[PDB]
Amino acid sequence: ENLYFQHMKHGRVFIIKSYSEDDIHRSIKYNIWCSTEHGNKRLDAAYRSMNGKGPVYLLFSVNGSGHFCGVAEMKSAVDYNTCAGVWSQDKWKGRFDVRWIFVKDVPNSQLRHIRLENNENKPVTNSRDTQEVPLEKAKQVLKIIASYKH
Numbered sequence: 553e554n555l556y557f558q559h560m561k562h563g564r565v566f567i568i569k570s571y572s573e574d575d576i577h578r579s580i581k582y583n584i585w586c587s588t589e590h591g592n593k594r595l596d597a598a599y600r601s602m603n604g605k606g607p608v609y610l611l612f613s614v615n616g617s618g619h620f621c622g623v624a625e626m627k628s629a630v631d632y633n634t635c636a637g638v639w640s641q642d643k644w645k646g647r648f649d650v651r652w653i654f655v656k657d658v659p660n661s662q663l664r665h666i667r668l669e670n671n672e673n674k675p676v677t678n679s680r681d682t683q684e685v686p687l688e689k690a691k692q693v694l695k696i697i698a699s700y701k702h
């Protein structure tokens with residue numbers, strides 16, 4: 553409630569969209585994630601180019617659910633050669649560490665009035681997986697999620 557996510561001077565924020573809620577449950581249990589091949593490459597470049605100077609945040613949402621389900625920070629580069637078949641389907645190859653910060657359902661109603669100037673001014677709730685969020689809009693999103701209460 554303005555107590556959250558001030559002093560976020562640098563850093564970068566991405567939307568994660570999963571059509572497997574089981575995969576997200578596993579992320580929360582073991583603090584790891586895996587995206588598509590092109591998604592992993594985008595997150596890998598953001599994390600590496602940050603060179604530790606700032607956080608990379610991930611805003612998670614289950615496709616079709618109508619709500620965001622929480623926030624985690626990237627905590628490692630992407631390892632592309634890892635054990636196969638750990639996710640809901642075999643097509644997900646690789647792994648990076650994350651640290652979950654919030655696990656809570658925030659309805660899209662609370663966020664849909666934030667639009668992305670880098671995505672044709674579309675609402676942030678209408679994003680695809682690994683859509684990057686401009687820093688000032690991300691700060692608005694993170695703060696709404698942080699303070700939202702049932």
Ligand SMILES: CNc1ncccc1C(N)=O
Pocket residue numbers: 569570571572575585586587588591639640644681
């Ligand atoms: C492991 N990750 C996933 N699982 C299921 C559906 C989408 C994803 C994704 N784009 O990250």
Ligand SMILES: [Cl-]
Pocket residue numbers: 618660661664677
């Ligand atoms: Cl909606």
